[PDB]
């Protein structure tokens with residue numbers, strides 16, 4: 241059902257890290273520890289997980305990330321990003337440990353937004369300008385509690401070009417937003433990943449599971 245080539249293996253069940261994670265790039269301080277990835281294991285650390293192969297959609301797709309933030313509740317500029325990006329590259333991690341401020345794609349961000357607070361905010365960039373997280377606009381949002389939970393959450397992104405590019409984003413099976421503004425994935429290969437950065441308070445951003453499906457799931 242899920243596309244193994246564009247998913248994480250069951251992390252707990254991994255016996256050969258090198259073989260079963262061959263399709264993934266571990267960036268910066270991310271470590272596999274007792275069955276999950278800790279993106280930000282230390283004070284003021286960054287980490288990322290990126291799929292090596294670019295993904296080309298057939299009809300529709302679903303991406304499900306299972307994540308949590310553990311160990312810290314309070315004020316911080318740290319956050320956790322989920323990315324769909326297209327076009328060339330660079331090695332920048334200036335934006336949430338994951339990207340240049342100038343990128344072409346979609347960033348779905350869990351952070352303390354300066355006006356919403358604890359939230360999911362979704363941003364599009366077309367590669368021509370620097371995203372300033374304070375002043376650049378997001379196109380969609382919801383309020384969502386994530387700090388300091390052992391209990392993980394699932395972000396589910398469904399995207400169907402055949403339904404005029406309907407993208408739905410659910411958090412724990414509840415709709416955060418729906419949009420038809422994100423169209424680039426229908427007609428171009430793109431890269432899939434996640435990244436996070438914390439501060440000295442040592443917020444632990446963690447990835448427990450990731451699955452991609454070559455369709456819209458019931």
Ligand SMILES: [K+]
Nearest residue numbers: 261262264265
């Ligand atoms: K690897």
Ligand SMILES: [K+]
Nearest residue numbers: 373374375376
């Ligand atoms: K903003």
